[PDB]
Amino acid sequence: TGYAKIEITGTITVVTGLHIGAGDGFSAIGAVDKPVVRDPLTKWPMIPGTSLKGKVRTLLSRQYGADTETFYRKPNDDPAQIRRLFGDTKEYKTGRLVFRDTKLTNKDDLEARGAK
RNA sequence: ACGGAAACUUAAAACCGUGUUGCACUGCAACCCGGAAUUCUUGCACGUCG
Numbered sequence: 755t756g757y758a759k760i761e762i763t764g765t766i767t768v769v770t771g772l773h774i775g776a777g778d779g780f781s782a783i784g785a786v787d788k789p790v791v792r793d794p795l796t797k798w799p800m801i802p803g804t805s806l807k808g809k810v811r812t813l814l815s816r817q818y819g820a821d822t823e824t825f826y827r828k829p830n831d832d833p834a835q836i837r838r839l840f841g842d843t844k845e846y847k848t849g850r851l852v853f854r855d856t857k858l859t860n861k862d863d864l865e866a867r868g869a870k
Numbered sequence: 871a872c873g874g875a876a877a878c879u880u881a882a883a884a885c886c887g888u889g890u891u892g893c894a895c896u897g898c899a900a901c902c903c904g905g906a907a908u909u910c911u912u913g914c915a916c917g918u919c920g
């Protein structure tokens with residue numbers, strides 16, 4: 755019952771497409787004007803942990819709410835039972851869940867299946 | 871032989887020690903790759919029998 759930093763592994767995988775975009779990036783080819791969140795160095799697609807926060811932040815606020823019904827209008831109006839993970843300016847808290855970034859791991863298999 | 875003639879205001883001592891430009895934040899909501907074009911017009915299973 756001392757200290758713990760429970761690290762969570764796993765592999766996310768797009769089944770459909772995915773168009774989490776970057777607005778005005780700097781890919782500069784054409785109709786990449788709707789780009790994806792890329793890496794700047796390797797230029798491989800990645801996923802910000804903000805979105806994986808800002809989807810589980812959103813889509814649990816209306817699942818822990820919208821049953822308690824009080825609509826939780828602001829990201830401090832949310833109850834403790836969400837924001838004690840996700841963080842609040844009310845209790846000044848640091849969150850408790852560091853949603854990390856992640857980028858393209860299996861680029862190698864995607865050249866194995868001929869994806870160009 | 872001038873209350874004269876000589877003399878350093880001098881020697882050392884760290885403006886240092888404790889301190890995150892930090893915590894809450896979806897690049898999101900709306901759109902059919904959709905509408906009009908004949909696989910068609912010329913064409914006989916037949917010439918041939920002491």
